[PDB]
């Protein structure tokens, strides 16, 4: 009962820190702690915690942002009321996009720091909710004062490069938005546009020059601001080309406009956003520096329909084909109004998050609202219908989930769907919109414009035409994603290559090769090569990689692997593709050469870099979920360490692992359940979320591999997130595999014996033997390429058995013995999985193709101690008794 006593002690200490240090439940807890001090008390403490939900609900009602974290994590945070720990490291789940606290500052997920207006004193006497509310108010008013002095600097007339290096992204962003709106309105009072168009063009060029020479975080900020500056240039250029004033007014009313109230006494509600006549209040919530969406006209139309829906307190519904960018449209609308839209990746947790977001007031988007069961779907539909009915009637409070909860006036609920539908109660109070395919040309053009390519429009048009040609011409494989996500992947991987290939068409062609060619078959590769020759003017000149090729050849020679052209191509593709992508997936037929390929690449990299290599071959399906990652034992609130978590802890704690490349290979099938718990490390976050809440960092050299045979159960998101390398054909010939098998069997008169065995495996007759064997009927059908591993090993071991009688016979008899053993091994490996009549037919084929000069293997022939005989003389007659 030691674990039970430990759990009881931990529960008592935690609840004492929560409540005892600072009525019926309190008295029962005091009595139980007295009994525990006198001394299976765990169920009583669990029931006390369950009955302490009303105090927990009051604590969650004191500050709304604490609600997001789970009950255990919230109890852990509120129990640590003096150490000031675990609250800063876990407020990403509460604030959405802010990672840690610096009180003098906060840090977002992307690393941007916010400087508060004034410091806040921290003391042990202050409880969590009071200082959290103080921090929230100070954060919002600090964002407002950054807004204020940004407009002070911009209306003063100072340059933009001095303010882009000082303040947060929201302040400079909305300052540029308001300033641009004022200039466009003032120039719309007249008919002159070229002056401010030239001014914003020079501003764009200046920000590009500052982007070229600044640090990485400032580079991210300048990119996320150049997105909106290119949008401003597009809008001003469109307004310049308008023939009449009515067309200019129409274009200006369609786009999103920003204004500020200069007369209200309030501060956080002094900004209204105008789009087609409707107004929304800016929230001054922190988001960081996220990936800004390129403002296409369809994005502005989505913003317009969401504005129209939210003006009359109706929810926003989006539907259409998957990959058209609806979730990102909702998120960009939310973060354009300075708020974080809470995403529910689609009952207890769902309705819990729903009442949380309707009490806080933050927007909530139900992404992929087409995968829930009928009962939970209908019930959460009724819940959202109740929320919308409360919002439309302006109810101060709502009786949601059988409790009376306040209703924030700024709460909105959004829905996205992927058909290929909204229920009646939801459709009575929602606005359905069907966005079309996004403008890939405009998105690619603007991304190339930030990336600095001198030819952006024509190059982007060529790229999207190339991808549509491949989507129209190649076969309909299950893993052929040729949408906007892979185009953005091509453009993102075009970034490390420019340091050696330059800003031009060659970088685009090479990155297109590196991230499109591996995931194709054979005729698809031919189509890709022909279309790359036809569309792009570059012929794909070879790069300087002779050293890496020679290291690869040395690795193959020292590991026994020969180098065919297709094996060389697959190795170069894998190396160039692991240079950028962290986690890779290798796929192909069974026994095609995946492990040999990546082992050869590892040895080549070890020779080329002189760097230590650590390999953890962990089959996914041989360990259970608890053993692979970890299990939280609910019996005593204990924890068990899984293998992958243990090796991450070992590599994180470390001096050997600080100077080594560590590789994890999942050499089995892709399980969706085993990879959806791994989704936290597949993205750019590179942080593993353990079931107990532990966050173990992953170093950049910790490179993950995968190795399976099929992709019918792999999610398309993980297909796009991880690199996919396809083995359409074997990387070997038959003779090369035979030679490697012979070499590894020798390693696992000797030289003359090896030479005679290798010369006996003549490929001309062997190819015909294998072709004849492939036409037979085999039980449990296995390829000849996977039967060579027995056909060589059996003969090698038979000769290794007979080696000690090989010094007392003539050369012709030795050759006859070797040939007979080879024929026997070939029979019992190639055609050894078929009927007796077919085995005899294979004996006739062997005797036909290996010639009459060699020893003729009979159907029942063998070697006895040496002389040639049959098995008829080895049969012992058995006299059986009656019983």
């Amino acid at each position: 009962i030691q674990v039970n006593w430990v759990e009881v002690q931990f529960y008592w200490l935690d609840l004492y820190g929560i409540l005892g240090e600072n009525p019926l439940e309190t008295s029962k807890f005091k009595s139980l702690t007295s009994e525990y001090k006198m001394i299976l008390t765990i169920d009583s403490l669990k029931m006390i915690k369950s009955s302490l939900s009303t105090f927990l609900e009051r604590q969650r009602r004191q500050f709304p942002r604490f609600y997001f974290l789970g009950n255990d994590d919230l109890l852990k945070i509120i129990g640590s009321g003096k150490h000031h720990d675990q609250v800063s490291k876990f407020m990403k789940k509460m604030f959405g996009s802010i990672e840690s606290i610096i009180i003098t500052g906060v840090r977002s997920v992307e690393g941007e720091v916010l400087n508060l207006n004034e410091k806040i004193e921290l003391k042990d006497s202050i409880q969590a909710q009071e200082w959290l509310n103080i921090l929230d108010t100070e954060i919002k008013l600090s964002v407002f004062t950054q807004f204020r002095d940004c407009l002070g600097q911009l209306k003063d007339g100072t340059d933009i490069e001095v303010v882009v290096s000082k303040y947060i992204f929201q302040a400079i962003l909305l300052s540029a938005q308001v300033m641009w709106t004022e200039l466009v309105e003032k120039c719309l009072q007249t008919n002159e546009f070229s002056k401010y168009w030239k001014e914003v063009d020079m501003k764009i060029k200046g920000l590009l020059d500052k982007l070229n020479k600044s640090s990485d975080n400032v580079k991210k900020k300048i990119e996320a601001l150049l997105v909106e500056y290119l949008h401003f240039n597009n809008v001003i250029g469109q307004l310049k080309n308008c023939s009449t004033k009515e067309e200019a007014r129409l274009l200006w009313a369609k786009v999103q406009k920003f204004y500020q109230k200069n007369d209200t006494l309030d501060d956080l509600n002094s900004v209204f956003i105008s789009q087609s006549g409707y107004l929304l209040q800016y929230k001054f919530e922190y988001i960081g520096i996220p990936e800004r969406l390129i403002y296409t006209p369809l994005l502005l139309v989505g913003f317009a329909t969401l504005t129209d829906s939210l003006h009359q307190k109706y929810g926003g519904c989006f539907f259409g084909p998957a990959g058209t960018g609806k979730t990102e449209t909702v998120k960009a609308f939310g973060q354009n109004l300075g708020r974080v839209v809470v995403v529910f990746n689609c009952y207890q947790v769902l309705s819990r998050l729903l009442v949380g977001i309707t009490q806080i007031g933050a927007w909530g988007c139900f992404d992929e609202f087409n995968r829930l069961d009928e009962k939970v779907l209908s019930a959460v539909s009724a819940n959202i219908q109740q929320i919308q009915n409360g919002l439309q009637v302006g109810k101060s409070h709502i009786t949601l989930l059988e409790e009376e909860t306040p209703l924030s006036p700024h709460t909105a609920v959004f829905i996205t769907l992927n058909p290929g539908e909204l229920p009646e109660n939801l459709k009575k109070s929602f606005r359905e919109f069907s966005m079309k395919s996004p403008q890939s040309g405009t998105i690619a053009e603007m991304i190339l414009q930030i990336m600095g390519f001198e030819d952006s429009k024509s190059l982007a048009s060529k790229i999207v035409h190339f991808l549509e040609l491949l989507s129209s011409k190649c076969s309909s494989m299950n893993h052929y994603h040729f949408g906007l996500r892979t185009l953005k992947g091509v453009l993102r991987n075009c970034s490390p290559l420019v340091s050696e290939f330059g800003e031009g068409e060659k970088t685009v062609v090479e990155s297109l090769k590196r991230v499109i060619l591996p995931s194709l078959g054979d005729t698809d590769e031919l189509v890709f090569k022909d279309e790359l020759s036809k569309i792009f003017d570059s012929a794909g000149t070879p790069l300087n990689s002779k050293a890496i090729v020679q290291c690869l050849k040395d690795a193959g020679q020292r590991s026994g692997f020969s180098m065919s052209e297709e094996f060389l191509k697959k190795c170069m593709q894998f190396y160039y593709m692991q240079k950028t992508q962290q986690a890779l997936i290798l796929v192909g037929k069974a026994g095609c050469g995946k492990t040999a390929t990546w082992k050869t690449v590892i040895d080549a990299m070890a020779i080329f870099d002189g760097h230590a290599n650590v390999v953890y071959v962990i089959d996914t399906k041989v360990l259970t979920k608890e053993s692979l990652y970890g299990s939280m034992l609910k019996a005593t609130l204990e924890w068990r360490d899984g293998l992958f978590t243990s090796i991450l802890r070992r590599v994180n704690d470390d001096g050997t692992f600080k100077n080594s490349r560590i590789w994890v290979v999942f050499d089995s099938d892709l399980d969706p359940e085993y990879v959806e718990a791994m989704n936290s490390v597949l993205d750019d976050n590179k942080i593993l979320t353990l079931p107990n809440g532990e966050r173990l960092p992953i170093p950049p050299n910790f490179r993950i591999l995968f190795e399976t045979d099929n992709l019918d159960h792999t999610t398309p998101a993980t297909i796009t997130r991880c690199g996919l390398l396809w083995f359409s054909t074997d990387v070997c010939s038959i003779s090369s595999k035979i030679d490697h098998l012979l070499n590894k069997s020798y390693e696992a008169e000797l030289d003359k014996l090896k030479d005679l065995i290798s010369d006996s495996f003549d490929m001309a007759s062997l190819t015909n033997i294998f072709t004849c064997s492939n036409d037979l009927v085999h039980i449990l059908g296995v390829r000849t390429f996977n039967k060579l591993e027995t056909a060589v090993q059996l003969a090698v071991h038979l000769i290794s058995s007979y080696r000690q009688w090989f010094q007392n016979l003539d050369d012709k008899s030795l050759k006859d013995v070797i040939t007979l053993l080879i024929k026997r091994s070939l029979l019992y490996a190639l055609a050894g999985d078929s009927t007796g009549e077919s085995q005899r037919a294979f004996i006739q084929t062997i005797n036909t193709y290996f010639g009459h000069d060699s020893q003729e293997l009979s159907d029942y022939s063998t070697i006895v101690i040496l002389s040639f005989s049959s098995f008829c003389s080895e049969i012992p007659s058995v006299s059986l008794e009656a019983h």
């Binding site: 007014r249 369609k254 129209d308 009724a382 109660n425």
Partner: protein, 441 residues
């Protein structure tokens, strides 16, 4: 044979199933009302009268033509049967040839020859069957207590039920559903009405099907008390024991475009003279697009549902445009784009349908000095020195003066006559094909 035909009808849709006891009571109605050939003819008339109202328009014509075919195949000769099957085959485009010749037959051949499919389909109902039952006839001649009404979207029988309330001197308690408070209110009102009485109505049980299938089957001769249930034909399947215990009635949409204009215009009570003019134009546009929606193969590509929520959204947008413009220079391009793209074109996924809505908006909301919204009537622009009451008076006067022509599906909706005749040909073809499939077995 007739019960086998009705079972085949019930095998198509979940709302058209028939019990044996219903048919036996329908047969008893023949002797209740006030020789064997006359009893058979009365049986045919009574079955059609009591089971047309449970089917929509297409199945009404299918049932009428099949029942006429059965009766005439039994009664008339072989040449009559061959002639009628020839006309069915040429309607279905399956068999060709002139009939081998009766005033009814030559009238029907005149109808078929001139390519009038609606007249050919309605000839059976016009000639053979005499009586047709409306909602009042089926609610008055019913010994049942619970009534289930089904209809397509963008039409409601609630207005007909209030009309019956004003006719039958009863008070309806409309009970909207969708929330748990509304569920408790519904249960309380059903408990009140099952003791006291009064006509009690339920709207759109389709989203409250869970409460229905947990309450109403267990819940199922009070005076002046009838329970009305409203659902949708295109919605989810209702429970079979609940369906068998109620008198199923299908309500049908109006065919009038200008009636829809009057219905939309009479519900807009007030916001100056230009707001009144814009609301009039919006009502006309909503009626035009709703009328064009129902012609599914030709007027549009799919079936859309532009409900009153879209009208409310567009009305709020017009109010916001008129309010935030002090120069009285109405941005016609802005309102055209926001209606064709955001308000009405939001739920449209196809491109040709978006082009159709854009063309309709350009024709209606053009904002010209003399706007001819239809080939019949022209709406002049308002004067700046007219009251809103005077404006409503002249709009009501110009609505009442104009009349709806016979070809309003072509001229008013701006469609070629070839598309209308092709749609009617498709309707007659599917009706005759279903009748042939029923008639072979």
């Amino acid at each position: 044979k007739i019960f086998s035909m009705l079972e085949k009808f019930g095998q198509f849709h979940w709302f058209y199933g028939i019990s044996i006891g219903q048919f036996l009571s329908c047969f008893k109605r023949v002797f209740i009302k006030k020789r064997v050939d006359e009893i058979l003819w009365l049986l045919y008339q009574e079955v059609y009268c009591q089971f047309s109202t449970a089917l929509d328009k297409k199945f009404k014509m299918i049932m009428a033509m099949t029942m006429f075919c059965l009766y005439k195949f039994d009664i008339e000769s072989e040449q009559y049967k061959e002639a009628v099957l020839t006309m069915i085959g040429v309607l279905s485009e399956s068999s060709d040839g002139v009939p081998k010749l009766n005033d009814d037959l030559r009238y029907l051949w005149d109808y078929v020859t001139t390519k009038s499919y609606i007249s050919a389909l309605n000839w059976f109902k016009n000639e053979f069957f005499v009586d047709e039952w409306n909602i009042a006839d089926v609610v008055a001649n019913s010994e049942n207590n619970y009534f289930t009404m089904a209809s397509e979207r963008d039409v409601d029988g609630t207005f007909k039920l209030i009309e019956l309330a004003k006719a039958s001197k009863e008070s309806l308690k409309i009970i909207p559903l969708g929330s748990i408070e509304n569920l408790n209110y519904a249960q309380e009102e059903i408990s009140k009405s099952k003791i006291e009485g009064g006509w009690i109505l339920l709207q759109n049980i389709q989203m409250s099907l869970s409460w229905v299938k947990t309450y109403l089957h267990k819940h199922v001769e009070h005076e002046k008390f009838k329970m009305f249930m409203t659902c949708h034909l295109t919605g989810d399947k209702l429970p079979a024991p609940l369906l068998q215990r109620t008198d199923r009635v299908v309500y049908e949409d109006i065919p009038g475009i200008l009636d829809t204009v009057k219905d939309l215009w009479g519900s807009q009570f007030f916001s100056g003279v230009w707001s009144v003019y814009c609301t009039f134009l919006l009502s006309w546009f909503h009626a035009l697009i709703t009328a064009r929606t129902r012609l599914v193969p030709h007027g549009f590509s799919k079936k859309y549902y532009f409900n009153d929520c879209d009208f409310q959204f567009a009305s709020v947008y017009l109010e916001n445009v008129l309010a935030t413009n002090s120069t009285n220079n109405i941005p016609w391009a802005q309102v055209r784009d926001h209606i064709a793209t955001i308000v009405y074109g939001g739920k449209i996924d196809e491109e040709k349908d978006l082009e159709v809505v854009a063309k309709l908006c350009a024709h209606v909301f053009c904002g010209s000095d003399n706007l001819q919204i239809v080939p019949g009537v022209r709406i002049p622009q308002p004067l700046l020195q007219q009251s809103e009451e005077e404006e409503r008076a002249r709009l009501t006067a110009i609505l009442s003066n104009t009349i709806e022509p016979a070809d309003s599906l072509s001229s008013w909706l701006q469609l070629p006559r070839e598309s209308i005749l092709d749609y009617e040909r498709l309707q007659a073809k599917e009706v005759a094909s279903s009748t042939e499939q029923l008639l072979q077995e």
